[PDB]
Amino acid sequence: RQMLRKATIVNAGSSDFLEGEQVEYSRVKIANRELEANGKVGATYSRDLLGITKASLATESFISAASFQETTRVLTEAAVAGKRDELRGLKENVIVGRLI
């Protein structure tokens, strides 16, 4: 189940054209798009297989996965992009020192 995260988007209308997106966010944005009066906003996606180290490093929270493997790389993607952690998983909470 955790290798099946990260789908790939065939069609437009949801922005995000032709690249690796969360399946969660895509199903949420398409759900909200079908909830809206416009049904063409939905797009077809294709799920991807990842492969468990790829799938760790690709986690939304830049704090985990930084501390998994590759720290230089991680922090450079994150510094240039300007991403926020949100603290939503268990390793982040540990490292900040808060409950899990």
Binding site: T72, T76, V80
Partner: protein
């Protein structure tokens, strides 16, 4: 904390040599290009108005000096990292994004359909982000607090 003021802004090797190179792929240059021309070696034609060398490109520095004498005109080339700062300073993501979109339509190769998307998702990240690209090569270097460097 602390800080130290640098004469000639350099390095920040954290970017650039962490593959892939954001400075390389941001400016559409190979990392042997910019890596080669950071210190010493080429003069990295920057702006290059009224210059025989392409506004963007490199050249043999001895050949470039001979070329400038042959040209009879002076081209604002920068051999140090200031040309990457200048080039890097003159780069606009929105202008690059419009060029990239035209290039993606122009490209007939899927290989060319990947790189381009990398540059869209990168430069776009700098736009929505609000970081200036200039910042990558650094001028003021911050120094680490004393007690966590004990003696």
């Amino acid at each position: 904390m602390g800080h130290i003021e640098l004469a000639s802004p350099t390095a920040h090797i954290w970017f650039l040599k962490s593959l892939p190179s954001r400075i390389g792929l941001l400016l559409d240059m190979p990392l042997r290009d910019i890596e080669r021309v950071l210190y010493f070696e080429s003069y990295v034609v920057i702006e290059g108005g009224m210059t025989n060398l392409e506004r963007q490109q490199i050249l043999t520095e001895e050949q470039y000096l001979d070329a400038l004498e042959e040209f009879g005109d002076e081209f604002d080339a920068k051999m140090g990292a200031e040309a990457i700062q200048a080039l890097l300073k003159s780069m606009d993501l929105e202008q690059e994004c419009e060029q990239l979109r035209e290039e993606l339509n122009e490209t007939n190769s899927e290989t060319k359909r990947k790189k381009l998307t990398k540059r869209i998702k990168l430069l776009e990240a700098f736009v929505q982000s609000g970081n200036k690209p200039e910042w990558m090569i650094l001028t003021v270097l911050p120094v680490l607090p004393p007690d966590l460097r004990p003696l």
